[PDB]
Amino acid sequence: VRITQGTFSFLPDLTDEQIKKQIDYMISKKLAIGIEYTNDIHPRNAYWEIWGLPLFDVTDPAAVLFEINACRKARSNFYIKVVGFSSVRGIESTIISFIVNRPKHEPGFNLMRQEDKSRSIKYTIHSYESYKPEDERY
Amino acid sequence: VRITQGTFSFLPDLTDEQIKKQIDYMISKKLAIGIEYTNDIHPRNAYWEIWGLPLFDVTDPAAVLFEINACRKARSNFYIKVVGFSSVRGIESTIISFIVNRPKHEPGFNLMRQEDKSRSIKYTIHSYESYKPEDERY
Amino acid sequence: VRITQGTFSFLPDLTDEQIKKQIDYMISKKLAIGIEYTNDIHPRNAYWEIWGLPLFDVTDPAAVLFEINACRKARSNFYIKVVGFSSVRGIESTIISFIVNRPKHEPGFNLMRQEDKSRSIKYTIHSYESYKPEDERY
Amino acid sequence: RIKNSRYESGVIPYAKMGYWNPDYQVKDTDVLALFRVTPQPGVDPIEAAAAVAGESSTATWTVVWTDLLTAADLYRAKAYKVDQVPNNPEQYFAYIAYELDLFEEGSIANLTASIIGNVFGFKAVKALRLEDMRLPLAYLKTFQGPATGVILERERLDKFGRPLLGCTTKPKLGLSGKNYGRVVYEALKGGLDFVKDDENINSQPFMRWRERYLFTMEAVNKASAATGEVKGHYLNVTAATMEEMYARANFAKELGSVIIMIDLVIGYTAIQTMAKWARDNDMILHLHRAGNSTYSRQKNHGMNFRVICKWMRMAGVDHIHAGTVVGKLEGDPIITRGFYKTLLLPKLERNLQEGLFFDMEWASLRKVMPVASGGIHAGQMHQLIHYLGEDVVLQFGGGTIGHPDGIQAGATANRVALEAMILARNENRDYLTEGPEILREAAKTCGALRTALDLWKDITFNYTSTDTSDFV
Amino acid sequence: RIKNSRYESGVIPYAKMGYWNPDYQVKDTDVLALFRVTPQPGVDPIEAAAAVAGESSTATWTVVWTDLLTAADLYRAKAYKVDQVPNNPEQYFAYIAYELDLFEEGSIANLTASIIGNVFGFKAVKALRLEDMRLPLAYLKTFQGPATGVILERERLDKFGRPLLGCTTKPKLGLSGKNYGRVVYEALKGGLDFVKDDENINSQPFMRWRERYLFTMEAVNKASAATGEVKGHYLNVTAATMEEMYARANFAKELGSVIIMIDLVIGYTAIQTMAKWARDNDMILHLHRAGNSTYSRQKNHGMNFRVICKWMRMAGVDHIHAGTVVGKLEGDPIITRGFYKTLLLPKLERNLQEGLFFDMEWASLRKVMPVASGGIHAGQMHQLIHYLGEDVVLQFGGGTIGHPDGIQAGATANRVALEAMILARNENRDYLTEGPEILREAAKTCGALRTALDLWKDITFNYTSTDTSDFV
Amino acid sequence: LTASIIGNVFGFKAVKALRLEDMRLPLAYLKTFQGPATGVILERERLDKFGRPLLGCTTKPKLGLSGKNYGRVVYEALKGGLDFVKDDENINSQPFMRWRERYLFTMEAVNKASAATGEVKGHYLNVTAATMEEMYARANFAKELGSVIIMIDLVIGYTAIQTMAKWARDNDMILHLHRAGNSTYSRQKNHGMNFRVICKWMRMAGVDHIHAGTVVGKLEGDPIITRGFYKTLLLPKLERNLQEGL
Ligand SMILES: O=C(O)[C@@](O)(COP(=O)(O)O)[C@H](O)[C@H](O)COP(=O)(O)O
Ligand SMILES: O=C(O)[C@@](O)(COP(=O)(O)O)[C@H](O)[C@H](O)COP(=O)(O)O
Ligand SMILES: [Mg+2]
Ligand SMILES: [Mg+2]
Ligand SMILES: [Mg+2]
């Protein structure tokens, strides 16, 4: 499948040129920029692994590109995303999150249907790769 | 196993000659004809994938045969069924559904028995092929 | 007190001349006319004693006056009222009820206040004359 | 493969989609609605009527093939007649018919979600007013109707042959529970049948609800023992959540109150829930139509109050305010007569002057008692009886409490005025014309009434009505 | 003995009764309301403003001595400023201040019972519109605010940086539960974040609610497994009684739905009850403003939608439909901008052009997600982003299902169009002007979008807005 | 309805015999009734079985099997190709087999058969009992175990049937009615009540299945009169036809 989590995942995978322009957007909005990664892309997997510590006052986009490329080099068969956080009072949350690296092939998800009361079903979605240990995925 | 979902699945797999006669029946009853397919034959999998859009005013059975054969050519290792829908007020539902294509070998289903209160069990039926990713089934 | 049950009880006690005109009103509306009496004027005393049987097709007001006066003669120290009933489908109820006789002096009512949960009270209203047996009232 | 017919993708006008059919024969099971449509300049009236019909039933702005998966022809609503409004070239009366199967049984919410859901904000229509509706016998039978109803109400009160008299406590806001009970006792003892909370009296810093309920019930029972009458006070159970309303209603039930009141502003689901509660707990339910004139005042847009009268008689309310012709609030005599007929009659006959556009049988659902309130006083009594009739609750707030000699005196004045007037009516006197003299004659024996007549003698509310008939 | 002063019995004008005070200093705890008053010919504007203030707070038509039993001077509402409406000699803007103590904490019902209770049907006022309200910090803190709120909603969905995409299932009425689920699966798999019941889909002869809930949840979970996204479908729990609504809401809860929807037509008490339920049960609550345009369309009478936006953000709703500027329903760009600001911002600044007459702090109550729906299609994407911004749910019913190549293709077209547009926005391109070209460029790679752009290319809804600004 | 129509008149001395043949129930009255909890169309959608009759089987011997053995028969019949198997109408809870065992063992058999065929399978668990509380207990346990269907016997009576029809609608359960006791009044042409009347009353009440006869079986069923019964149960509008007794 193509995992369509992330702000731009129905578009082609962004080139470094396109990523740089998005980082300029994040810098103009004074966002803290974080790089996160996982090989468990369950929609409800709220906490991907953080690559270091979020870059807080960023003036130069190249610093962020360097870290994205460093993460890609160390975690090639992982999903990597860039997150932009706003500390402004009404928000205090992520305002942009997009995928910058995908493994070569995504298997997809298994859907478990447990029969419960009458026609009610309890569902479990589980990625096929997460039936393999972490070190053996993708 | 032989999946016995479908109106004629205890009989031998219908020849194109037999299918044509069933399409004549659907045409005499002014049914909308749909072709659907899946590789997850769980009994409760209510929504198989639609092959295109349902053929609504069909006069010639050969048009439907063409699409059944086109689906079989593109989805050879899938379950394919033909559905006939009636828009008549008391009905507004499917009145015939039969399998026109089966993969070469069907593994069957796993039965999970989770122990709950006293001797009550919660059951999960899951097809063995659906433990494999979609692109690797059958 | 002056019991103000009845349609015209804030006005002076109606003269026979005034009663006759009210009976003409009841006759023009084809009402069944009933004469009822009691010496227990509790507001919730829904069933006063009937003086005979309701006069159904009345053409002459004098017939009703005769019965009102006969009731007054036999039950002088009782409350007597004239009731007009309409059998018309949406109604099937009394549409006028007024007092035509009152005893010479009305004592009034006692109010009992039984303390219940917290500041809630359960109330009993009881006419002072109904502490005397029926034959000894008024 | 792609479609090729009436169901091929694209935008075609609503009239071509099947929502305009001048030859449609109205089935007895159809819900019929009459709209006053003002289309935008350039929009054909037939297309506007079809647009209203379409968007209140099955259509959207573009063709969708999924219609074919339903019995589309039956579910489409059809505008079947468009007439021009008598003295207005911009407005049209559009008659639309809706199939019974489109509605959920017993639900005012589902009915309104289709009829008034989205069409009033449709760009192509400049203005739109829902004037009347014919609700079919088969749909009407899925509704409870009034919990008590006029007939049973009068039997529980033992009060027949005359209007009932009420009073809103004044000032509207600010009294304590203790003082509220004072006013209630005085007015009921003085001769009123009912007194009520004002619609905005609920539970506030100056007075929370439990005190008012406790003190009021003491006053109600004292007044009952002092008069020999069944007395009541409308305890207002309006609250923010359903649980809080139930708490207030159940406490009123525990104390033995004969009646409670709710405000329209709680909404349709809360009203229906309370109507059922009232039927199950032998409680008279009074509705105050708070917020109603936000949409019913103007002739060109909104919803005419007779529609709300039908929906609320269906919902199950026992009293609803229906206007005084001569009071401080809007009420044209001919249009107000239509409202009263809608609430009280077993069958409605089409009468264009009253705005009753459809004949309608009421499926033997009980009658709602109309309430006439706002800026009225004794003196107007003869025309109140003349315009509003016998089955109405006449409420005098200011007309009672504003009396110089006290609240008891105010109440007596109103009660004596009422009784003298219907006595005269029953004697076949022309009470409309002789009215001032009937009152003057009764005033000779009742000083309280004399003072009331002198005080408010010249108070009249002569203003031009906004909601008027189109056929006069 | 009888009184002799300001409190002696009689009728004196509302301005003399204390409801007009041009020197009143607005206390920070006051509820302020702005009314557009059209008095009847002959009624002085100041007297009309005083009449509105009086009857929405403490007065009645005649003097009542009982005022003296309260701190009357504090409880009286005061009209403190009357200005004439810029290009209309008949209309006046009246600013009225109400004391905090007049209102029940946390209750929209009590607030409305005073502000819109009776004054709109007052004979002396020919027309009356409630334009705006300043709700004080201390009153606002007694309200829950949005159950989830925009920020938490996006965190539960893991969707940030772009508008969310939805779709109403069409035809509006007539589909079965099984077929409803078909449409839901196709649209969600194709790329929409949400699909919804239409406001009038509740439980009817053609489809009862339990089937739709069961089949829809199967479709939602299949779509989620097929995309790797959190998906949802607004299950409509609107019903006739509160118990029936709770039953539907609780079944949706049991099945694991992330969202449910209600219609404004259920009323304020039912809405507040469901807002609390949603907070307590981690459910996103969508409000459909059914019936809203019955009172908000006309500039001279009713209630402007920004007032309903404030009341519903207070009540606790998570989504409310706030209009599309370019769609089939009414939405003037400048007035719609005011609505969006009311729902999304922490503090509102007075801006006469948008109709925001008061500065207002929102007491840190959560943000409501505006929903833009009705007659929109890809192609309008660049101006949808331009007028509505980032935090909005863009809903394409016909714009998805009406696509010739199927529902999945419709959904993809809309999703690709959205993403390409905010990508371009983020790249600092003038997307308003370059918009047609951005879409055309994305269409080269996505056939589904190309076909959507061709199909609805010339569909525009150019009509004159009724609800317009007075300062342009 | 029945308290007026069949209340006292059948024992009236002046009438030697009396039979209720048919009734026209008006649209406005019909709308105050729920109708079938599931109904044919939705039932087939929940089972994913269309175009052919459904096949069932009553377990035999009627009385005497244990819970364990009842489940054996259910498994074998469902795996072999039947869509449904059922309790016999007089199988409720008795010394030889109490109800909880039968429900537990049957559901194991139903799920094994489903996994063995790829079909939705079911067994009509009979919830007939002496009191309403006991019926609710049995129905709710069937609900807890995930049974797609339950069955009741006419002999519980009209109020219990209506109460269970509402329960079935609210709990997504197919409700089968066995017309036990029906032929006590419907067999003879001169007195009693013709079964088409009971068909109308039960379609109104809300039942999802009712036994309507086989023409060629061991129980009474004239082809023309039986056709009338089937039309009453299945059609949206009934047309007057004197031959069928409509
Ligand atoms: O608040 C008021 O103004 C009233 O209490 C009347 O007081 P007064 O008796 O002292 O005037 C009523 O609620 C209005 O009649 C409601 O209007 P409508 O009846 O038109 O719904
Ligand atoms: O019923 C309708 O018409 C819609 O489903 C839109 O359908 P389409 O997407 O197929 O046009 C929405 O509820 C309206 O947008 C409501 O209006 P508003 O948003 O103005 O409240
Ligand atoms: Mg009032
Ligand atoms: Mg909609
Ligand atoms: Mg048997």
Automatic annotation (TrEMBL), chains A, B, C:
Residues 4-103 form the Ribulose bisphosphate carboxylase small subunit domain. Belongs to the RuBisCO small chain family. It is found in: Plastid, Chloroplast. Keywords: Calvin cycle, Carbon dioxide fixation, Chloroplast, Photorespiration, Photosynthesis, Plastid. Heterohexadecamer of 8 large and 8 small subunits. It comes from the Eukaryota. InterPro entries: RuBisCO_ssu, RuBisCO_ssu_dom, RuBisCO_ssu_sf. This is Multifunctional fusion protein. The basic functional RuBisCO is composed of a large chain homodimer in a 'head-to-tail' conformation. In form I RuBisCO this homodimer is arranged in a barrel-like tetramer with the small subunits forming a tetrameric 'cap' on each end of the 'barrel'. RuBisCO catalyzes two reactions: the carboxylation of D-ribulose 1,5-bisphosphate, the primary event in carbon dioxide fixation, as well as the oxidative fragmentation of the pentose substrate in the photorespiration process. Both reactions occur simultaneously and in competition at the same active site. Although the small subunit is not catalytic it is essential for maximal activity. RuBisCO catalyzes two reactions: the carboxylation of D-ribulose 1,5-bisphosphate, the primary event in carbon dioxide fixation, as well as the oxidative fragmentation of the pentose substrate. Both reactions occur simultaneously and in competition at the same active site. Although the small subunit is not catalytic it is essential for maximal activity. One of its GO terms (biological process) is reductive pentose-phosphate cycle. Its main location: plastid. GO terms for cellular component: chloroplast. Gene3D superfamilies: Ribulose bisphosphate carboxylase, small subunit. The keyword Protein biosynthesis does not apply. GO terms for molecular function: ribulose-bisphosphate carboxylase activity.
Automatic annotation (TrEMBL), chains D, E:
It is found in: Plastid, Chloroplast. Heterohexadecamer of 8 large chains and 8 small chains. One of its GO terms (molecular function) is magnesium ion binding. Mg(2+) binds at residues 196, 198-199. Its EC number is 4.1.1.39. The gene is rbcL. Keywords: Calvin cycle, Carbon dioxide fixation, Chloroplast, Lyase, Magnesium, Metal-binding, Monooxygenase, Oxidoreductase, Photorespiration, Photosynthesis, Plastid. The basic functional RuBisCO is composed of a large chain homodimer in a 'head-to-tail' conformation. In form I RuBisCO this homodimer is arranged in a barrel-like tetramer with the small subunits forming a tetrameric 'cap' on each end of the 'barrel'. Substrate binds at residues 118, 168, 172, 289, 321, 373. This is Ribulose bisphosphate carboxylase large chain.
